[PDB]
């Protein structure tokens, strides 16, 4: 099709000027056209926000009915991603709108799962995913492919959080085969590394470094690796050149703390941890916060709170961390396994 052909040539013959050429081309397409519809998903799937936003504004005041719906549904997704709205506000706007497109009906169920994943709320994510059939789509084949990759990466993160890690890798490797879009490969590799964080140190670093190379240049994608490598190395007590000492973000400060413990500077770690407790953070965050306090004080109550927050978050992978500490402090292994399952 026009868009697919355009993109495939830009990629194969001008790979290094893809954004510059596609940005210009996509912004000169007529809002009402099938190509302008394919263009909006390209911009959002590649996380080209400034472009996606210009495309949404132009296609929201459009005459084609499919082009106007796309802009309206994505407008909510862009507001949820930018942090202007709540997952429930978004869920309300989706029920209010009457979606006539089978395509903007599958995207509607995915729009919330992205906020759910970002804020440690994994509980509501798996059910929505089962309301999606990509055979209900037949007019755009560019989207069905992009939505197909989008679902595999979401399904990998869902299986990762359920401790079904063989299924997580299978769905991330499927996505890596299904696409050439950078964000999907970057998030596929990141999910594979997090799936090996306890199983195999080497394979976690190999898949995290494979993603870091693809992300290189996108500072926002790079940061996901610098954070996870930083974590991987602090858990296996290894040299960690991936720590950001300049960031105030909770998840970053948590990595500075995990290093001070590995270096046995507990007084500075507990001071920095205590200042974090007052700060706004999700339930998943607090599972890690109390795991760190337990490593400094060896208080079983801290490991218990870690277990509690991981339980709320519904994180069946990272709950293993406090569970293992409790095993080594001679807590009953059978009870620890029931809390894991």
């Amino acid at each position: 099709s026009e868009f697919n052909s355009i993109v495939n040539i830009v990629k194969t013959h001008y790979p290094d000027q893809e954004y510059e050429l596609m940005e210009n081309y996509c912004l000169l397409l007529d809002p009402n056209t099938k190509a302008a519809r394919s263009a909006l998903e390209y911009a959002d799937a590649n996380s080209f926000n400034t472009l996606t936003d210009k495309l949404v504004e132009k296609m929201s005041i459009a005459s084609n009915l499919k082009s106007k719906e796309y802009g309206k549904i994505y407008e909510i997704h862009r507001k949820l991603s930018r942090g202007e709205i709540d997952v429930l506000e978004a869920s309300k706007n989706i029920g209010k709108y009457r979606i006539k497109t089978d395509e903007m009906n599958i995207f509607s169920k995915m729009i919330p799962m992205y906020d759910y994943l970002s804020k440690g709320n994994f509980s509501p994510m798996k059910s929505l995913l089962k309301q999606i059939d990509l055979n209900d789509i037949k007019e755009n084949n560019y989207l069905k492919k992009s939505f197909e990759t989008r679902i595999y990466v979401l399904l990998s993160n869902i299986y990762l959080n359920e401790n079904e890690l063989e299924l997580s890798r299978k769905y991330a490797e499927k996505a890596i085969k299904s696409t050439d879009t950078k964000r999907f490969l970057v998030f596929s590799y990141l999910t594979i590394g997090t799936s090996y964080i306890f199983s195999d140190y080497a394979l976690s670093k190999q898949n995290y470094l494979s993603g870091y190379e693809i992300a290189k240049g996108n500072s926002v994608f790079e940061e996901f690796f610098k954070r996870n490598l930083s974590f991987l190395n602090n858990f296996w007590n290894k040299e960690n050149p991936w720590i950001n000492y300049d960031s105030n973000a909770v998840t970053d400060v948590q990595e500075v703390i995990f290093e001070l413990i590995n270096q046995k500077k507990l007084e500075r770690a507990l001071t920095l941890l205590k200042s974090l407790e007052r700060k706004k953070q999700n339930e998943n965050d607090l599972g890690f916060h109390y795991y760190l306090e337990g490593l400094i004080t060896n208080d079983k109550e801290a490991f218990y709170k870690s277990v509690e927050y991981f339980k709320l978050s519904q994180d069946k992978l990272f709950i293993k961390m406090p569970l293992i500490k409790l095993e080594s402090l001679g807590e009953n292994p059978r009870l620890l396994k029931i809390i894991s399952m």
Partner: peptide
């Protein structure tokens, strides 16, 4: 802590 994305 760890980070996730899709």
């Amino acid at each position: 802590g760890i980070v996730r994305g899709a």
